[PDB]
Every structure is written in C-alpha cells, then in structure tokens.
Amino acid sequence: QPEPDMITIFIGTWNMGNAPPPKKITSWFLSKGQGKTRDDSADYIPHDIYVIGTQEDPLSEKEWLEILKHSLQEITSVTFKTVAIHTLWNIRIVVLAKPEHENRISHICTDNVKTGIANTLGNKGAVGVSFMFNGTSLGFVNSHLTSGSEKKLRRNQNYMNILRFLALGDKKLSPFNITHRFTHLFWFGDLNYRVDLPTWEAETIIQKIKQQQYADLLSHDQLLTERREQKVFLHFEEEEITFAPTYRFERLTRDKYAYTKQKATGMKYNLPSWCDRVLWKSYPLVHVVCQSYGSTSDIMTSDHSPVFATFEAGVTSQFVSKNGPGTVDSQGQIEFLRCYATLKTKSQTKFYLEFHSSCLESFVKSQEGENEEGSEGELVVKFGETLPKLKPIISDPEYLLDQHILISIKSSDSDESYGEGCIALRLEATETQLPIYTPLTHHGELTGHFQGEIKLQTSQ
Ligand SMILES: COC(=O)c1ccc(S)cc1
C-alpha cells in the first residue's frame, strides 16, 4: 500500500457561545453552507485529518469526542482515531485521523498559551497540536483572541505572545518559533477582528449582507487591514471570504444579527464581523491548496456560525537509503555563494548563521560575517563564499529537492537570533548557481532579508 504524496485536511473553528450543539452538525464537516463549499460528489470521501477548534466550549472532552466521532462515522462510515485533544479553559482543539494513518503519525505535541496580565488573564489564549505525518511536520493553532471592536492592537499582541510561547514541533529548532517549525502551519479560531465601520451604519451593513455584497465590508475588516499593514499574521495566507459575517447572530435563527449594545455585552456594539477565521503558512514551494472556506447555515445554537476550511497538502515519505539515516551520503552537498543578510538592527555585534534541517545530522554554525554599512542606514552582513558546505544524510534528488533549510542569524555577543527564515531546495536545476531569498523575522516581525546563491549536488 503506497505512501501518500498528498492528504486532505479539514480545519473547523466554532465559538459555541457556551451552549451545547444541536443534534446534527454534519454540514460543518461536509463544508456545506455559504462561501467556497465542497462538491456534493465528495460527501462520502473522508478527509485524512480533521482538526476541530472550539471556543466558549461548554462540553467535557468526552462529550465532544463522542459527538465528533459519531458525526464523522455517519458521514464516512469510518471510525476515526483520536490523535490529540487539548483544552485551555473553554478553548479546545481535537485532531482526528483515518485509522490507516495511525502508524504514519508520530511526535505528537500539545501546548497552550494564556494571553493578557491580571484583569486580561483568565479566558483568552490558544491551544495547539503538532505531529509528523511521515516526512512532513504539521502544526495547528486554535486561538480565542481579545474581543471588542476597539482592541485590534491587543489582538495583534495576543498573536505575538502565542507564536512566541507556544511550545510545539521539534525543540532542537531552538532559534525558531512555530511560524518556522512546520511544513504546514494552520492557525484558526475566534480571532475576534471586526468590521471597522461606524455604529450608526449597522443597518446599512445588514442590508449589504442580505444582498451578499461583502466588498465594502471586507475593505474595513481589521484582520485584512492589519495584515496588509504587516501588523499581524505576516507571511500567512487566507482564502478569499465569500460567506456572510459569522458573528453576532440571534440564537436559534440565522435571520438576525444582534449588534446593539446590551448589559450582557458590557454595553458594546457587535457590528456583524468575520470573527472566525482560518489562515495557513507553508514552507516555500510546498503544495497547499484551499479547496473550501465557508460557514454553515443550519447550526444555530451559538451567536457564531461554524467556519470550515479544507486543504490539499503535499506530504513526503519517511525516506531510508543505504547511507542516511545514521550517516551522510557524500554524493550530496549544499553550497552557498555571494550570501548576505540585511538587518534592520541598530546594533553592531558580529553575526553568524545557523543552518537547521532534517536533511542534516545536526545544525551547522557558520563563521562570523563581515559587517558593512548599507547606503540607506541598514546593516549588511557579508558571508561571501565563507559559508560551510552542508552534508545531507541522503543524496537522492527525490528526497533532497523536497527539503528545506531554516536559517537563523545570531549575535556573536548574546547568541540570540536576530532573524529567522527558510530556503526551499526545490530548485530549477542541480549543479547550477541559482538565486535564493528569504525574508527574516523575529517574534514574527520583519527584521531583515537573506539572499545569495545556492548550488545543490544530488546523486543524479
Ligand atoms: C520549549 O520546548 C519546546 O519547544 C517543545 C516542543 C514540543 C514538545 S512535545 C515539547 C517541548
């Protein structure tokens, strides 16, 4: 039975509003309702992995697991295996996979981050799960960020705290946060970003939604605007939104948005908003295609509607050769020519590079680069032709061209990372000097760039 080169992944996010679900929620797992929906002809085809994020979840883990498993069994006639479940307060993540994947999944990690301080510590934060699927690392983050139309900056801060402190994936990747640890990272939840229009425009917004005219609302969506200004979710993707705002509804219908200020809302307006979102970030040149992104129409227990997204994701096999794993394959090498880092820093320490990849036996430290002054005030760290020759464990191009090199640029003085990025080995040619590039981030903010040339030697 051959190893897959593609899997499909279901991502669900639902703020349950502290209410039990209705008896039928199959529409969610079938990607049926509004937006980019799944074709009817696929309804019996199981996804490989289902990742369910809930917020304001009033159920026990046992209660929700029974509903989820019985839901998927009704749809697919398959009894899914539980990979992981993790709850922080009323924020929960469940990972279910087809039984045939049980011996393809390993290195399961779970963690949570609590956001805020004092007042603002106690119900917001994130849960996450990571694991290996054969040769491919997968990470999943469900976050419930700070609420309220006037707190977009707090939401951005919550995002930076979650990506700094959530401890998932390979702990040997010590310079790298979750935004660099996974082949594919999915980040979803009640992100709580709002449509930033005046309160007086509530009925106008409702009108627009009834006409399915979302353009003038999406142009004021705080997540889209904050992402365009590079304030949050830098280098993440989101599918185009073609479904109605998923918040705030009157319960037990979808006919009414409940936006007016009430004691129960702290006297805050809740204009219709896309609170409930799915974003992703995959390593460069890895296949990832969003095949659905929408909301259900028929699950009305909460003041939020469930959101679904599905993806085709490229995966690789657990490669064995005669040589690696457990030695190098001298027929393979990675060389770097004419490389330089450009850093936004005001500092003047010397810098060196670290190269991390599962195609290496362990990470590789470079020599210090040569600091020059850039013509516009920047720091340019020149490596020229000084970078070490990297020795992969396997030389077969079917393996090596699918790999990635993570780069950290570190201060000689403190050994702290000033920037992290990633280079694909999916090159146009081998034995050929070719341009490489990655932006560099630190705590998920832009700190610079790394560029130069690469020359990859494989066994072919
Ligand atoms: C800070 O340490 C980590 O990054 C980490 C990652 C994964 C697992 S399972 C455990 C710990």
Residues in the chain: 460
**Rounded distance between C-alpha atoms, residue 452 and residue 215, angstroms:** 40
Residues 344, 457 contacting (CB under 8 angstroms): no
Angle, CA of 30, 254 and 272, to the nearest 5° = 105
| φ, ψ of residue 65 in degrees (nearest 5) | -55, -40
CB neighbours (10 Å) of residue 421? 25
Q: Where are the domains of the chain?
A: 1-325, 326-460
Q: Is the C-beta atom of 171 inside 6 A of ligand 1?
A: yes
| Dist. CA 157–CA 144, nearest whole Å | 13
Q: DSSP letter for 453, please.
A: E
Distances (CA, A) of 281 to 17, 207, 399, 425: 28, 34, 22, 18
Centroid of ligand 1 to alpha carbon of 167 (angstroms) = 4
Query: Rounded CA gap, 166 and 68, in Å?
Result: 26
CA–CA gap between residue 309 and residue 292 (Å, rounded): 5
Strand ranges inside 65-150, DSSP E: 81-88, 91-97, 105-114, 125-133, 136-144
How many angstroms is it from 123 CA to the middle of ligand 1? 23
H or E stretch including 242?
none
Of 234, 310, 358, the closest CA to residue 51 belongs to 310
End-to-end CA distance of the chain: 27
Per the structure block, which two tokens stand in for 123?
Answer: 């119900």
- Which residue among 83, 86, 111 is best mutated to probe the pocket of ligand 1, counting the most ligand atoms within 8 A of its Cβ? 111
**What is the DSSP track for 170-196?**
-TT-TT--HHHH-SEEEEEEE----B-
Identify whether the C-beta of residue 17 lies closer than 8 Å to the C-beta of residue 289. Answer: no
Query: Using CA positions, which residue lies closest to atom 6 of ligand 1?
Result: 168
Element (H, E) at 100: none
Ligand 1 atom closest to Cα of 109? 9
The Cα 415–Cα 368 span in angstroms is 12
Q: Which of 165, 175, 103, 158 is nearest to 128 (CA)?
A: 165
Cβ of 178 closer than 6 Å to ligand 1, yes or no, is no
Work out the burial of residue 99: count CB atoms within 10 Å of its CB; fewer than 13 is exposed, 13-18 middle, 19 or more buried.
exposed
CB 109 less than 6 A from any atom of ligand 1: yes
Query: 157 alpha carbon to ligand 1 midpoint, in Å?
Result: 22
CA gyration radius, the chain: 23
Q: Which tokens go with 49?
A: 């992995």
Token pair of 99 as six digits: 């039984």
Q: What technique determined this structure? A: X-ray
Say if residues 109 and 148 touch (Cβ distance below 8 Å): no
Listed residue (283, 285, 276, 284) closest to 309, CA to CA: 276
Q: CA-to-CA distance for 227 and 236, rounded, in angstroms?
A: 9
List the one residue out of 346, 415, 340 whose CA is nearest residue 370: 340
Question: What kind and span of H or E run contains 400?
Answer: helix 397-400
How far apart CA 378 and CA 220 sit, in angstroms, is 34
* DSSP H stretches of helix in 77-189: 152-165, 178-181
Do residues 246 and 275 touch, judged by C-beta distance below 8 A? yes
In the structure encoding, which two tokens stand for residue 438, read together?
């990655």
What DSSP designation does 389 have? P
Q: Find out whether the beta carbon of 160 lies less than 6 Å from any atom of ligand 1.
A: no
Collapse the DSSP code of 2 into the 3-class scheme (helix H, G, I; strand E, B; otherwise coil) and give the result: coil
Q: Which residue, chain included where needed, has tokens 């003047």?
A: 348
Whether 162 and 188 have beta carbons less than 8 Å apart is answered as: no
Burial track 218-252 (b if 16+ CB lie within 10 A, e otherwise): bebbbbebbbeeebbbbbbebbebebbbbbbbeee
Residue 172 to residues 132, 356, 413, Cα–Cα distance (Å): 15, 9, 21
List gaps in the chain by the residue before each (C–N > 2.5 Å): none
Q: Is the CB of 166 inside a 6 Å radius of any atom of ligand 1?
A: no
Cα–Cα distance list, 139 to 50, 232, 314, 378, 430 (Å): 13, 18, 14, 34, 31
